[PDB]
């Protein structure tokens, strides 16, 4: 979890809370996606919205599939191997873009690249294909960079 930002670490805490609220006995890709969409002003959320995807629409489609469990375990809810894979893919996606940090945008790209999980299935069906979201990530950051250079020009 070394290079995780405050916001990228809060998405994993909210994943544990989302699993607990639904009384699930596991943290899957679904809970990392439900964690992510709390951060409405981050690059991940802004990337999806700029592709005409709505956050509460993502929530409804994830929740319809995964349902509700019997009872959350009393201790830590265990991450699934694919949930672990999403987090590993997120930290390999950051360097490839030339980023010195793991942000909400890398977790979104991790969820999509994982490919097999509920998160990837929901996002792909809403038109959140990997290369399309990557391009949107890059354009948003380049777009933010230009606005802040205008600011900087006092």
DSSP type of residue 77: P
CB atoms within 10 A of CB 95: 12
Give the integer Cα–Cα distance in Å for 35 and 13: 8
Tell me the C-alpha distance between 91 and 76, whole Å: 23
Distance of alpha carbon 140 from alpha carbon 118, whole angstroms:
26
Q: Give how far Cα 26 sits from Cα of 9, 63, 85, 108, 151, Å.
A: 18, 15, 14, 20, 45
Could you tell me the CA-to-CA distances from 53 to 3, 32, 97, 120, 143 in Å, in that order? 28, 17, 23, 14, 19
46 with 54: CB under 8 angstroms?
A: no
With 0-12 / 13-18 / 19 or more C-beta atoms within 10 angstroms meaning exposed / middle / buried, residue 26 is: middle
Domains of the chain, earliest start first: 1-154 (1.10.1780.10)
Tally of residues, the chain: 154
Could you give the residue ranges of the DSSP H alpha helices within the chain?
6-21, 29-36, 43-50, 55-66, 81-97, 104-114, 118-125, 130-152
């Amino acid at each position: 979890f070394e290079r995780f930002t405050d916001r990228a670490r809060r998405v994993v805490v909210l994943a544990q809370e989302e699993a607990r609220m639904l009384n699930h006995n596991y943290i899957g890709t679904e809970h990392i996606l439900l964690g992510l969409i709390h951060e409405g002003e981050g690059v991940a959320a802004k990337s999806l919205e700029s592709l005409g995807i709505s956050l509460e629409g993502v929530r409804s489609q994830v929740e319809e599939i995964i349902g509700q469990g019997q009872q959350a375990p009393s201790g830590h809810i265990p991450f699934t191997p694919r949930a672990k894979k999403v987090l590993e893919l997120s930290s390999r996606e950051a360097p490839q873009l030339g980023h010195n940090y793991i942000g909400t945008e890398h977790i979104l790209l991790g969820l999509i690249r994982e490919g097999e999980g509920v998160a990837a299935q929901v996002l792909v069906k809403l038109g959140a294909e990997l290369t399309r979201v990557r391009q949107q990530v890059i354009q948003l950051l380049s777009g933010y960079k230009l606005a802040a250079a205008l600011e900087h020009h006092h």
